[PDB]
Amino acid sequence: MAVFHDEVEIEDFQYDEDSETYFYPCPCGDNFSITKEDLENGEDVATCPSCSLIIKVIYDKDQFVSGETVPAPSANKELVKLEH
Ligand SMILES: [Zn+2]
């Protein structure tokens, strides 16, 4: 490795309705974490509390950066059954 670990699309991440946070599955055992606000500002990097690695989060800046345009809902997803 030389620059970052690997960039992954936000769609792959797991949205957290609890407090608007995205997480990514790590091979070390834990899962990365990144707040929605971070992506809205530019913080497209996730850090693991165990391995302490770095990962790039790809998303739509046009969607995240919504000044006077509130997006709309599109179906629902319930597949939270990832146990370690
Ligand atoms: Zn990790």
mmCIF file of N, CA and C and ligand atoms in Angstrom:
data_model
loop_
_atom_site.group_PDB
_atom_site.id
_atom_site.type_symbol
_atom_site.label_atom_id
_atom_site.label_comp_id
_atom_site.label_asym_id
_atom_site.label_seq_id
_atom_site.Cartn_x
_atom_site.Cartn_y
_atom_site.Cartn_z
ATOM 1 N N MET A 1 0.841 -1.228 0.000
ATOM 2 C CA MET A 1 0.000 0.000 0.000
ATOM 3 C C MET A 1 0.862 1.259 0.000
ATOM 4 N N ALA A 2 0.352 2.326 -0.614
ATOM 5 C CA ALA A 2 1.079 3.592 -0.683
ATOM 6 C C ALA A 2 0.185 4.770 -0.297
ATOM 7 N N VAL A 3 -0.998 4.845 -0.910
ATOM 8 C CA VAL A 3 -1.943 5.922 -0.631
ATOM 9 C C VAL A 3 -3.324 5.364 -0.288
ATOM 10 N N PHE A 4 -3.729 5.526 0.979
ATOM 11 C CA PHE A 4 -5.024 5.040 1.455
ATOM 12 C C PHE A 4 -5.145 3.520 1.293
ATOM 13 N N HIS A 5 -6.250 2.960 1.780
ATOM 14 C CA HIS A 5 -6.487 1.523 1.681
ATOM 15 C C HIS A 5 -7.247 1.194 0.400
ATOM 16 N N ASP A 6 -8.478 1.702 0.298
ATOM 17 C CA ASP A 6 -9.319 1.472 -0.876
ATOM 18 C C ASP A 6 -10.566 2.353 -0.828
ATOM 19 N N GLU A 7 -10.925 2.941 -1.969
ATOM 20 C CA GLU A 7 -12.104 3.802 -2.053
ATOM 21 C C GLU A 7 -13.358 2.969 -2.304
ATOM 22 N N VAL A 8 -14.414 3.238 -1.535
ATOM 23 C CA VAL A 8 -15.672 2.510 -1.675
ATOM 24 C C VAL A 8 -16.859 3.466 -1.750
ATOM 25 N N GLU A 9 -17.827 3.127 -2.601
ATOM 26 C CA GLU A 9 -19.027 3.942 -2.777
ATOM 27 C C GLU A 9 -19.889 3.937 -1.517
ATOM 28 N N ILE A 10 -20.445 5.103 -1.188
ATOM 29 C CA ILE A 10 -21.300 5.255 -0.012
ATOM 30 C C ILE A 10 -22.487 4.287 -0.049
ATOM 31 N N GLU A 11 -22.933 3.927 -1.256
ATOM 32 C CA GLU A 11 -24.049 2.996 -1.415
ATOM 33 C C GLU A 11 -23.733 1.654 -0.750
ATOM 34 N N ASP A 12 -22.452 1.276 -0.764
ATOM 35 C CA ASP A 12 -22.009 0.029 -0.148
ATOM 36 C C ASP A 12 -22.029 0.140 1.378
ATOM 37 N N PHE A 13 -21.752 1.344 1.887
ATOM 38 C CA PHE A 13 -21.735 1.599 3.329
ATOM 39 C C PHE A 13 -23.109 1.344 3.958
ATOM 40 N N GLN A 14 -23.163 1.394 5.292
ATOM 41 C CA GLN A 14 -24.409 1.175 6.023
ATOM 42 C C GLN A 14 -24.885 2.464 6.688
ATOM 43 N N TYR A 15 -25.952 3.057 6.149
ATOM 44 C CA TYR A 15 -26.502 4.292 6.706
ATOM 45 C C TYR A 15 -27.059 4.049 8.109
ATOM 46 N N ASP A 16 -26.735 4.951 9.034
ATOM 47 C CA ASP A 16 -27.197 4.845 10.412
ATOM 48 C C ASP A 16 -28.213 5.940 10.720
ATOM 49 N N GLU A 17 -29.497 5.587 10.656
ATOM 50 C CA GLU A 17 -30.576 6.539 10.931
ATOM 51 C C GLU A 17 -30.473 7.123 12.344
ATOM 52 N N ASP A 18 -29.859 6.365 13.260
ATOM 53 C CA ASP A 18 -29.696 6.793 14.650
ATOM 54 C C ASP A 18 -29.144 8.217 14.747
ATOM 55 N N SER A 19 -28.046 8.480 14.037
ATOM 56 C CA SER A 19 -27.423 9.805 14.054
ATOM 57 C C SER A 19 -26.737 10.120 12.718
ATOM 58 N N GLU A 20 -27.302 9.607 11.621
ATOM 59 C CA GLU A 20 -26.759 9.832 10.279
ATOM 60 C C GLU A 20 -25.259 9.526 10.214
ATOM 61 N N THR A 21 -24.919 8.237 10.242
ATOM 62 C CA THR A 21 -23.521 7.805 10.179
ATOM 63 C C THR A 21 -23.370 6.593 9.259
ATOM 64 N N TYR A 22 -22.245 6.516 8.550
ATOM 65 C CA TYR A 22 -21.990 5.400 7.638
ATOM 66 C C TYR A 22 -20.829 4.548 8.143
ATOM 67 N N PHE A 23 -20.959 3.230 8.009
ATOM 68 C CA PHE A 23 -19.920 2.307 8.469
ATOM 69 C C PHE A 23 -19.532 1.309 7.381
ATOM 70 N N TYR A 24 -18.282 0.839 7.432
ATOM 71 C CA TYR A 24 -17.781 -0.125 6.454
ATOM 72 C C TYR A 24 -17.162 -1.342 7.142
ATOM 73 N N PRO A 25 -17.453 -2.560 6.639
ATOM 74 C CA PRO A 25 -16.914 -3.802 7.212
ATOM 75 C C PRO A 25 -15.405 -3.933 7.012
ATOM 76 N N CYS A 26 -14.681 -4.108 8.115
ATOM 77 C CA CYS A 26 -13.230 -4.252 8.067
ATOM 78 C C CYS A 26 -12.820 -5.701 8.323
ATOM 79 N N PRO A 27 -11.784 -6.188 7.611
ATOM 80 C CA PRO A 27 -11.290 -7.563 7.769
ATOM 81 C C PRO A 27 -10.624 -7.803 9.127
ATOM 82 N N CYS A 28 -10.261 -6.722 9.821
ATOM 83 C CA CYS A 28 -9.623 -6.834 11.129
ATOM 84 C C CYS A 28 -10.608 -7.350 12.183
ATOM 85 N N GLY A 29 -11.890 -7.004 12.021
ATOM 86 C CA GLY A 29 -12.911 -7.435 12.965
ATOM 87 C C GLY A 29 -13.977 -6.378 13.201
ATOM 88 N N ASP A 30 -13.553 -5.117 13.285
ATOM 89 C CA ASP A 30 -14.471 -4.002 13.510
ATOM 90 C C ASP A 30 -14.961 -3.415 12.184
ATOM 91 N N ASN A 31 -15.643 -2.266 12.253
ATOM 92 C CA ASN A 31 -16.166 -1.613 11.059
ATOM 93 C C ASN A 31 -15.875 -0.111 11.083
ATOM 94 N N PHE A 32 -15.454 0.423 9.933
ATOM 95 C CA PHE A 32 -15.151 1.850 9.799
ATOM 96 C C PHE A 32 -16.388 2.698 10.104
ATOM 97 N N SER A 33 -16.186 3.997 10.335
ATOM 98 C CA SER A 33 -17.297 4.900 10.637
ATOM 99 C C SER A 33 -17.047 6.307 10.090
ATOM 100 N N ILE A 34 -18.099 6.915 9.537
ATOM 101 C CA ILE A 34 -18.017 8.263 8.979
ATOM 102 C C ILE A 34 -19.376 8.968 9.051
ATOM 103 N N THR A 35 -19.402 10.145 9.673
ATOM 104 C CA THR A 35 -20.637 10.919 9.815
ATOM 105 C C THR A 35 -21.071 11.530 8.480
ATOM 106 N N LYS A 36 -22.385 11.709 8.310
ATOM 107 C CA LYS A 36 -22.933 12.294 7.081
ATOM 108 C C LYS A 36 -22.385 13.702 6.858
ATOM 109 N N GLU A 37 -22.235 14.456 7.950
ATOM 110 C CA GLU A 37 -21.715 15.820 7.880
ATOM 111 C C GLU A 37 -20.298 15.836 7.307
ATOM 112 N N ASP A 38 -19.497 14.832 7.673
ATOM 113 C CA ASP A 38 -18.123 14.728 7.185
ATOM 114 C C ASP A 38 -18.097 14.683 5.662
ATOM 115 N N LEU A 39 -18.946 13.835 5.085
ATOM 116 C CA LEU A 39 -19.030 13.700 3.633
ATOM 117 C C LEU A 39 -19.530 14.997 2.992
ATOM 118 N N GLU A 40 -20.451 15.683 3.673
ATOM 119 C CA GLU A 40 -20.999 16.942 3.165
ATOM 120 C C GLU A 40 -19.927 18.034 3.101
ATOM 121 N N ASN A 41 -18.931 17.948 3.985
ATOM 122 C CA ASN A 41 -17.853 18.936 4.029
ATOM 123 C C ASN A 41 -16.665 18.526 3.160
ATOM 124 N N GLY A 42 -16.393 17.223 3.103
ATOM 125 C CA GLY A 42 -15.272 16.728 2.326
ATOM 126 C C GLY A 42 -14.546 15.581 3.010
ATOM 127 N N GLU A 43 -14.830 15.371 4.303
ATOM 128 C CA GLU A 43 -14.208 14.298 5.068
ATOM 129 C C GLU A 43 -14.682 12.935 4.566
ATOM 130 N N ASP A 44 -14.100 12.489 3.458
ATOM 131 C CA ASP A 44 -14.444 11.199 2.859
ATOM 132 C C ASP A 44 -13.460 10.120 3.307
ATOM 133 N N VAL A 45 -13.070 10.173 4.579
ATOM 134 C CA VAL A 45 -12.133 9.205 5.128
ATOM 135 C C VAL A 45 -12.685 8.548 6.389
ATOM 136 N N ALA A 46 -12.564 7.225 6.450
ATOM 137 C CA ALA A 46 -13.033 6.463 7.598
ATOM 138 C C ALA A 46 -11.857 5.850 8.345
ATOM 139 N N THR A 47 -11.887 5.947 9.670
ATOM 140 C CA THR A 47 -10.817 5.406 10.500
ATOM 141 C C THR A 47 -11.355 4.338 11.449
ATOM 142 N N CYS A 48 -10.662 3.200 11.502
ATOM 143 C CA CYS A 48 -11.064 2.095 12.366
ATOM 144 C C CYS A 48 -10.459 2.254 13.758
ATOM 145 N N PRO A 49 -11.253 1.994 14.813
ATOM 146 C CA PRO A 49 -10.786 2.107 16.201
ATOM 147 C C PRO A 49 -9.878 0.945 16.627
ATOM 148 N N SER A 50 -9.714 -0.050 15.748
ATOM 149 C CA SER A 50 -8.875 -1.206 16.047
ATOM 150 C C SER A 50 -7.599 -1.193 15.205
ATOM 151 N N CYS A 51 -7.744 -1.386 13.892
ATOM 152 C CA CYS A 51 -6.592 -1.395 12.989
ATOM 153 C C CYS A 51 -6.039 0.014 12.764
ATOM 154 N N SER A 52 -6.904 1.025 12.890
ATOM 155 C CA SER A 52 -6.504 2.419 12.696
ATOM 156 C C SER A 52 -6.082 2.668 11.246
ATOM 157 N N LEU A 53 -6.824 2.082 10.310
ATOM 158 C CA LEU A 53 -6.537 2.238 8.888
ATOM 159 C C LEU A 53 -7.346 3.388 8.296
ATOM 160 N N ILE A 54 -7.176 3.624 6.996
ATOM 161 C CA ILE A 54 -7.892 4.694 6.310
ATOM 162 C C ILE A 54 -8.568 4.176 5.042
ATOM 163 N N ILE A 55 -9.758 4.699 4.751
ATOM 164 C CA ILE A 55 -10.506 4.298 3.558
ATOM 165 C C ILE A 55 -11.250 5.486 2.955
ATOM 166 N N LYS A 56 -11.321 5.525 1.627
ATOM 167 C CA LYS A 56 -12.000 6.614 0.933
ATOM 168 C C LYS A 56 -13.459 6.290 0.681
ATOM 169 N N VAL A 57 -14.308 7.277 0.936
ATOM 170 C CA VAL A 57 -15.739 7.128 0.752
ATOM 171 C C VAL A 57 -16.222 7.952 -0.438
ATOM 172 N N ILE A 58 -16.699 7.264 -1.474
ATOM 173 C CA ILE A 58 -17.194 7.928 -2.676
ATOM 174 C C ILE A 58 -18.697 8.164 -2.582
ATOM 175 N N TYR A 59 -19.130 9.365 -2.958
ATOM 176 C CA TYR A 59 -20.547 9.723 -2.901
ATOM 177 C C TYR A 59 -20.864 10.868 -3.861
ATOM 178 N N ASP A 60 -22.139 11.250 -3.923
ATOM 179 C CA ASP A 60 -22.570 12.340 -4.787
ATOM 180 C C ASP A 60 -22.520 13.670 -4.037
ATOM 181 N N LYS A 61 -21.504 14.482 -4.336
ATOM 182 C CA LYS A 61 -21.348 15.787 -3.692
ATOM 183 C C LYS A 61 -22.558 16.678 -3.970
ATOM 184 N N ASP A 62 -23.166 16.507 -5.146
ATOM 185 C CA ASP A 62 -24.343 17.289 -5.525
ATOM 186 C C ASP A 62 -25.524 16.968 -4.607
ATOM 187 N N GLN A 63 -25.621 15.704 -4.187
ATOM 188 C CA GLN A 63 -26.695 15.264 -3.301
ATOM 189 C C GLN A 63 -26.399 15.647 -1.850
ATOM 190 N N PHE A 64 -25.169 15.373 -1.403
ATOM 191 C CA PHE A 64 -24.757 15.684 -0.032
ATOM 192 C C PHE A 64 -24.782 17.191 0.229
ATOM 193 N N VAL A 65 -24.292 17.971 -0.735
ATOM 194 C CA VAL A 65 -24.271 19.428 -0.613
ATOM 195 C C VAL A 65 -25.613 20.013 -1.046
ATOM 196 N N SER A 66 -26.572 20.016 -0.125
ATOM 197 C CA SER A 66 -27.904 20.539 -0.406
ATOM 198 C C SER A 66 -28.180 21.797 0.415
ATOM 199 N N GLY A 67 -27.909 22.961 -0.176
ATOM 200 C CA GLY A 67 -28.133 24.220 0.516
ATOM 201 C C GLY A 67 -29.606 24.547 0.682
ATOM 202 N N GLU A 68 -30.309 24.706 -0.439
ATOM 203 C CA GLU A 68 -31.736 25.025 -0.414
ATOM 204 C C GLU A 68 -32.550 24.005 -1.217
ATOM 205 N N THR A 69 -32.125 22.740 -1.174
ATOM 206 C CA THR A 69 -32.813 21.669 -1.892
ATOM 207 C C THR A 69 -32.861 20.396 -1.049
ATOM 208 N N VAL A 70 -34.025 20.112 -0.464
ATOM 209 C CA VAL A 70 -34.192 18.921 0.366
ATOM 210 C C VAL A 70 -34.561 17.703 -0.485
ATOM 211 N N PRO A 71 -33.683 16.678 -0.518
ATOM 212 C CA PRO A 71 -33.910 15.452 -1.300
ATOM 213 C C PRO A 71 -35.180 14.705 -0.879
ATOM 214 N N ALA A 72 -35.511 13.639 -1.614
ATOM 215 C CA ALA A 72 -36.706 12.846 -1.324
ATOM 216 C C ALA A 72 -36.371 11.372 -1.075
ATOM 217 N N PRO A 73 -37.251 10.663 -0.331
ATOM 218 C CA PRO A 73 -37.069 9.238 -0.005
ATOM 219 C C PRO A 73 -37.267 8.324 -1.212
ATOM 220 N N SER A 74 -36.633 7.151 -1.171
ATOM 221 C CA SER A 74 -36.740 6.185 -2.261
ATOM 222 C C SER A 74 -36.645 4.752 -1.738
ATOM 223 N N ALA A 75 -37.804 4.168 -1.411
ATOM 224 C CA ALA A 75 -37.872 2.796 -0.896
ATOM 225 C C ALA A 75 -37.128 2.655 0.436
ATOM 226 N N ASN A 76 -37.126 1.439 0.987
ATOM 227 C CA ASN A 76 -36.451 1.170 2.259
ATOM 228 C C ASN A 76 -35.607 -0.101 2.176
ATOM 229 N N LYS A 77 -34.580 -0.180 3.023
ATOM 230 C CA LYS A 77 -33.689 -1.339 3.047
ATOM 231 C C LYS A 77 -33.487 -1.847 4.472
ATOM 232 N N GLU A 78 -33.719 -3.143 4.674
ATOM 233 C CA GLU A 78 -33.556 -3.756 5.988
ATOM 234 C C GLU A 78 -32.757 -5.056 5.889
ATOM 235 N N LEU A 79 -31.431 -4.935 5.907
ATOM 236 C CA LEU A 79 -30.550 -6.102 5.824
ATOM 237 C C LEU A 79 -29.454 -6.038 6.891
ATOM 238 N N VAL A 80 -29.790 -5.478 8.053
ATOM 239 C CA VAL A 80 -28.838 -5.357 9.148
ATOM 240 C C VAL A 80 -28.760 -6.656 9.954
ATOM 241 N N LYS A 81 -27.968 -7.604 9.456
ATOM 242 C CA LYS A 81 -27.797 -8.896 10.119
ATOM 243 C C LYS A 81 -26.346 -9.379 10.015
ATOM 244 N N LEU A 82 -25.403 -8.434 10.064
ATOM 245 C CA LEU A 82 -23.980 -8.758 9.977
ATOM 246 C C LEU A 82 -23.379 -8.944 11.369
ATOM 247 N N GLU A 83 -23.238 -10.202 11.783
ATOM 248 C CA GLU A 83 -22.675 -10.521 13.093
ATOM 249 C C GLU A 83 -21.238 -11.015 12.962
ATOM 250 N N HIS A 84 -20.393 -10.606 13.904
ATOM 251 C CA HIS A 84 -18.987 -11.005 13.908
ATOM 252 C C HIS A 84 -18.712 -12.019 15.015
HETATM 253 ZN ZN ZN B 1 -10.407 -2.052 10.724
#
